[PDB]
A paper describes a structure:
IMP-13, a member of subgroup 2, sharing 92.3% amino acid sequence similarity with IMP-2 and 82.5% with IMP-1, was first identified in the Gram-negative pathogen Pseudomonas aeruginosa from clinical samples in Italy and is a common cause of carbapenem resistance, often involved in large outbreaks. Imipenemases represent one of the major groups of class B1 metallo-β-lactamases found in Gram-negative pathogens, and these enzymes can hydrolyze all bicyclic β-lactam antibiotics. The overall protein architecture of the IMP-13 apo structure is consistent with that of the previously published metallo-β-lactamase fold, consisting of a global αβ/βα topology with a shallow active-site cleft at the border of the two β-sheets. The structural information and dynamics presented here reveal important information about the mechanism of antibiotic binding, as well as a significant role for the active-site-covering loop (L1), indicating that the plasticity of the active-site region is important for the broad substrate recognition spectrum of these enzymes.
In the apo-state crystal structures, two positions for the L1 loop, open and closed, were observed. In the apoclosed structure, the loop is folded over the active site, while in the apoopen structure, L1 is extended away from the protein, leaving the active site accessible. We define the open conformation to be the loop pointing away from the protein toward the solvent and the closed conformation to be the loop positioned over the active site and pointing toward its rim. The distance between C-α atoms of Trp28 for the open and closed conformations is 8.8 Å. With the apoopen structure, on the other hand, the loop can be seen to point away from the active site, leaving the active site accessible to the substrate. As the loop appears to play an active role in the binding of ligands to the protein, prevention of the loop closing by an allosteric inhibitor could have a similar inhibitory effect.
Residue numbers in the entry: 4 to 223
Amino acid sequence: LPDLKIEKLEEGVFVHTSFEEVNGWGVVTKHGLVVLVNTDAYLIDTPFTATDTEKLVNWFVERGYEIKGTISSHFHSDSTGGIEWLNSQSIPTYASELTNELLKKSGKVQAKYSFSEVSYWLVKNKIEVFYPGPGHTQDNLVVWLPESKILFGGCFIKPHGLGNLGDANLEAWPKSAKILMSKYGKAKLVVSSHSEKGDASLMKRTWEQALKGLKESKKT
Ligand code: NA
Ligand SMILES: [Zn+2]
Ligand SMILES: [Zn+2]
């Protein structure tokens, strides 16, 4: 299993990359962020495992940062796998009320703190959590960093194909993708869960893939 990677994007923004075996043939790649406000650190998604969440936290703690909070972009384990471990360390975990309902329904440990607001400022003027509407999942969120114009699109941003449709809302995805394009056109960088980082055009590529997936589902 490849090791957790940490890469600096700019001052105050790091991408964490963790890996999971799909079964014998190679691995899934998952990107999240760590955002620094002075000496406060915020996890944007957890790695898949408690073990990789602890490695990630330990890397920032050793450099004099305090983990002030985590946000999970959706209920799937690639965003939420570390919540139980973070809770055991009394590190504040956040998810939307809908995300916590979906964790509870799937027999998973919930985030300690939840919110209902469509636009939720995890950190005033620094970290915005936004619900564009259903897509990859009913609850999928994005995270916007206004000072860097970095959008973390999580598993919503799907420039090359929508992936697993098990929990997806194909009827809503195109509308949700246009809402995102319309709000975050000033984005300098779009970081997705499962693809290479890109420019604002990844939001339009997602819209196109959403339209195509909906069209194909209506044919059969
Ligand atoms: Na450092
Ligand atoms: Zn997912
Ligand atoms: Zn994912």
